[PDB]
Design a binder for these strands. Structure first.
Ligand SMILES: Nc1ncnc2c1ncn2[C@H]1C[C@H](O)[C@@H](COP(=O)(O)OP(=O)(O)OP(=O)(O)O)O1
Ligand SMILES: [Ca+2]
Ligand SMILES: [Ca+2]
Ligand SMILES: [Ca+2]
Ligand SMILES: [Ca+2]
Ligand SMILES: [Ca+2]
Ligand SMILES: [Ca+2]
Ligand SMILES: [Ca+2]
Length: 902
DNA sequence: CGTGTTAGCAGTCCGCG
DNA sequence: GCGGACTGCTAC
């Protein structure tokens, strides 16, 4: 097999590299790497090296890496460009793996771990590590084994060994319900004392050194705790055995009260799953505890126990250890679903970077572009310093706030990357400028045609047509992967609906789920078999279709993020290829395109509907337009339609056969106008929206920019079995809105769009009546606790103190001296509740760490002093009034002359 | 060491015979 | 007590 790297580090003049060899064995080598950098030279000098603008360069081959670095300094002091890859480990990788890396994950040691630390004096701070590590579960991807390190004797208690037999037993038998499929994978190691546990752990670590190290919060707790604990017991050099190159870097963060650390372990690529989740999941969660995320991702129940965690080991060691093991498995289960490790590996090897650099789009792109240019013997420019300047972005139309009965939306595919490719926007393809007319003038095609010769953006930039730029070239490759995965995703989505439709009439028989690939549309034969399957088999098939869809989603949306991140990088001062002309060329072209196509759609629809001068396009944002289809429906008359699906079919046909070709013509013309390199403005029908036929449903509404709701029947070729609500920007979509309120506001919206005012009024009355019976956590607001200290004036609110911060401060006063009441962590999320006047807390609100029950010592009082009235008004009523006034609808029956009657 | 801009709502502070 | 300027937080 072809070789591939595992990790790479620069330490002084040495590259330290862990890799897999031709036989597939792990190896480590140290290399005194001899880097090259480049300087411009005279044209009269014959060379094979050119900068990206075609200017000749000369190679400087250096004796070592410090010399190369010191040369860059001397060049800076002289005032001349020092060209080439200045991050030497990227160059090393590029030299060593001068081919498309084909890697084998089965050879990569992925470690997943978590530790327990009993602490009677509050949170066990990793910087201090003053408490014993009394449990470690470490899963190894190569052994496929959970290695359990269990401390039996501690200052905080001596316990008996943990029982695997009892762990496997159901909770109802008094066991821990450790999932049966990992029971056989556990290797259990008890210890009489901490020192020998840790010694064994280190020696185990040396045998099975992680390449990828993951888990939940390992970066902020587990890794620094282990490191510091081993340091305090055996000394720093022993703690340094955690690095395969015996090298660590310790950096301390301080603010006012608490002190924290993150430890860099050289030769390991740490990918904290919480970080992967936050970057790649496209959620925003009210809490980031593992219990919460596992429940959200896996529908697994919360790992409940009696008493505080500080006493769980002594009171129930059996469960303590079992929960350590389960918490580690849960991360593996989440990754089995979301596949972020797979994505990080794909991305990392594709770019040729340290795997941990997938968190940096800038490092990723710099690496991709460098490798692309190196292949052509081209030399990359030196990074330069730039002041941060603002620049203009996308166009968002101001909608008339109203209900909108029938809506069809249209969307441009992967817009900004498409603009990059259409216009041929790159650092080295800039041809020159033209004098700009006002934007309105291009939108309306009255402005003089920018160029007969070059490809143009309405920001005034001109580009070469007859040569590809590195940026369009490289963005196209990733765009094309993204398209492949999205196709698989939509196919699995469509397959999902075929199953949901078949679950309407399940068959009374015992069979099994069909062996199929959900990434492709079910054939007619498969569809015929599905109609005859049992509910049990269909539901297993639906589960698999949905797992296939999530997998295709992870893969497509994060490739999308990466390419869009190349657009943004052009507007980041740290990017080697930072250029506000290129960034603005993209955004201004986008503004033109959206508004150009608005006019063309309005023109076309007035033509075919035989009217003149009316606004069919009701909204637009960046790359998408929303068309009122009322007059399309009215042109034929509703009476002609048999059912909902009928008119949906009608609009589907209308959009695809009539509108899209008009849109295509429209953009073809715009491309000619800007004299662009390749037409890539592909605007296709997105959603079809309306109320059920014959209902009193209103179909949809806008309240303002970025705030709207639609009852959608078809989305990107997916015909839903049941209508799905597409809600954007409204409180139902916000993580700060209480869970139960999201649920109630969504049902309010469902009723408005599908059923009508009267149905809405029925629900509202019911929810107002039962509001005060809801669980306090379900009705708490949520927020991030940033800059707590900045508003902390003797434990009281300082000037302009935010509501949620006031709540935290109130909490801090109430838990003063509680010793082991959970502290609010800076930057983390809290639940928030308003308090009635005269409460024992001495303020109008309280806040506590989210995903948790508020501590028992103050819980009673919180429940007693909650202001439900304020809570209802602020979280539910005020937003609902916003929705209903926009839709010209009432949530409460208004008074009228009829009230005089019985 | 480090993708981007556009945009609404909640809250504090301030003015307000 | 309701607006306007301001911070803080949260669809493309
Ligand atoms: N995370 C982001 N970073 C930078 N720019 C973004 C981001 N999200 C969106 N944009 C900009 C660039 C996008 O091309 C444009 C439109 O975004 P979006 O509506 O998500 O669809 P898209 O056209 O990029 O892709 P799709 O093919 O999924 O429709 O807005
Ligand atoms: Ca734990
Ligand atoms: Ca789009
Ligand atoms: Ca689309
Ligand atoms: Ca059937
Ligand atoms: Ca869009
Ligand atoms: Ca089309
Ligand atoms: Ca109390």
């Amino acid at each position: 097999m072809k070789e591939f790297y595992l990790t790479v580090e620069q330490i002084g003049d040495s590259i330290f590299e862990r890799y897999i060899d031709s036989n597939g064995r792990e190896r480590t080598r140290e290399v005194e790497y001899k880097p090259s950098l480049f300087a411009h030279c005279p044209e009269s000098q014959a060379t094979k090296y050119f900068d990206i603008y075609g200017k000749p360069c000369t190679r400087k081959l250096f004796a070592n890496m410090r010399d190369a670095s010191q040369w860059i300094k001397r060049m800076e002091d002289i005032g001349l460009e020092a060209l080439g890859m200045d991050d030497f480990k990227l160059a090393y990788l590029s030299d060593t793996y001068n081919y498309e890396i084909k890697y084998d994950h089965t050879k990569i040691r992925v470690a997943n771990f978590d530790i327990e630390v009993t602490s009677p004096d509050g949170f066990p701070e990793p910087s201090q590590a003053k408490h014993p590590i009394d449990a470690i579960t470490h899963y190894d991807s190569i052994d496929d084994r959970f290695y359990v390190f269990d401390l039996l004797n501690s200052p905080y208690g001596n316990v008996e060994e943990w029982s695997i037999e009892i762990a496997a037993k159901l909770q109802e038998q008094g066991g821990d319900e450790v999932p049966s499929e990992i029971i056989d994978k556990i290797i259990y190691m008890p210890f009489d004392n901490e020192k020998e546990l840790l010694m064994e752990y280190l020696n185990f670590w040396q045998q099975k050194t992680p390449v990828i190290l993951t888990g939940w919060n390992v970066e902020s707790f587990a890794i620094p705790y282990v490191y510091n604990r081993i340091k305090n017991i055996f000394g720093e050099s022993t703690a340094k055995r955690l690095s395969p190159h015996r090298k660590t870097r310790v950096k301390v963060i301080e603010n006012m009260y608490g002190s924290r650390e993150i430890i860099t372990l050289f030769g390991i690529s740490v990918l904290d799953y919480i970080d992967l989740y936050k970057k790649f999941s496209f959620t925003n969660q009210p809490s980031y505890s593992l219990d919460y995320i596992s429940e959200f991702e896996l529908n697994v129940g919360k790992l409940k126990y009696d008493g505080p965690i500080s006493k769980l080991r002594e009171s129930n060691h059996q469960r303590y250890i079992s929960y350590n093991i389960i918490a580690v498995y849960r991360v593996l289960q989440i990754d089995a679903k979301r596949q972020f490790i797979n994505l990080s590996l794909d991305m990392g090897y594709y770019a040729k970077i340290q795997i941990q650099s997938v968190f940096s789009p800038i490092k990723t792109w710099d690496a991709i572009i460098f490798n692309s240019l190196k292949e052509q013997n081209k030399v990359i420019p030196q990074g330069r310093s730039h002041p941060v300047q603002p620049y203009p972005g996308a166009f968002v139309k101001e909608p008339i706030p109203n209900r909108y009965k029938y809506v069809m939306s249209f969307d441009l595919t992967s817009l900004y990357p498409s603009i990059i490719r259409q216009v041929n926007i790159s650092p080295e393809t800039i041809a020159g400028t033209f004098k700009v007319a006002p934007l309105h003038d291009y939108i309306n095609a009255v402005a003089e045609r920018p160029s007969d010769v070059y490809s143009c953006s309405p920001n005034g930039m001109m580009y070469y047509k007859d040569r590809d730029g590195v940026v369009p070239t490289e963005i196209t490759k990733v765009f094309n992967q993204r398209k492949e995965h999205k196709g698989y995703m939509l196919a699995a989505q469509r397959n999902g609906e075929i199953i949901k439709e078949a679950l309407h009439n399940p068959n009374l028989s015992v069979d099994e789920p069909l062996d199929v690939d959900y990434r492709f549309d079910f054939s007619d034969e498969i569809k015929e078999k599905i109609k005859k399957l049992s509910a049990k088999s269909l539901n297993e098939m639906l589960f698999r279709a949905q797992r296939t869809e999530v997998a295709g989603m992870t893969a497509q949306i994060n490739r999308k993020l990466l390419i869009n991140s190349l657009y943004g990088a052009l507007g980041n001062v740290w990017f080697r290829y930072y250029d506000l002309r290129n960034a603005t060329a993209i955004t201004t072209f986008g503004q033109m395109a959206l508004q150009w196509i608005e006019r063309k759609v309005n023109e076309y629809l007035n033509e075919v509907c035989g009217t003149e001068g009316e606004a069919f396009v009701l909204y637009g944002d960046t790359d998408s337009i929303y068309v009122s289809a009322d007059k399309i429906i009215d042109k034929v008359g509703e009476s002609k339609f048999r059912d909902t699906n009928h008119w949906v079919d009608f609009l589907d046909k209308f959009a695809r056969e009539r509108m899209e070709p008009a849109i295509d013509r429209g953009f073809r013309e715009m491309c000619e106008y800007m004299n662009n390199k390749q037409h890539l403005m592909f605007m296709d029908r997105e959603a079809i929206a309306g109320p059920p036929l014959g209902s009193k449903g209103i179909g949809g509404f806008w309240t303002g920019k970025k705030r709207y709701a639609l009852n959608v029947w078809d989305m990107e070729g997916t015909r839903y079995a049941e209508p799905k609500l597409k809600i954007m920007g409204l409180e139902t979509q916000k993580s700060s809105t209480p869970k139960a309120v999201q649920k109630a506001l969504k049902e309010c919206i469902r009723r408005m769009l599908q059923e009508g005012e009267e149905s809405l009024q029925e629900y509202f009355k019911e929810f107002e009546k039962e509001f005060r019976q809801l669980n306090y956590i379900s009705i708490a607001s949520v927020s991030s606790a940033n800059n707590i200290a900045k508003y902390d004036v003797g434990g009281f609110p300082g000037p302009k103190c935010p509501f949620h911060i006031r709540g935290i401060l109130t909490y801090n006063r109430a838990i003063k001296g509680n010793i082991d009441a959970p502290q609010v962590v800076e930057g983390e999320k809290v639940y928030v509740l308003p308090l009635r006047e005269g409460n024992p807390f001495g303020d109008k609100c309280i806040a506590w760490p989210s995903g948790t029950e508020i501590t028992d010592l103050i819980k009673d009082d919180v429940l007693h002093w909650m202001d439900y009235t304020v809570l209802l008004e602020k979280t539910f009523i005020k937003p609902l009034e916003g929705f209903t006034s926009a839709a010209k609808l009432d949530y409460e029956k208004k008074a009228s002359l009829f009230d005089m009657f019985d």
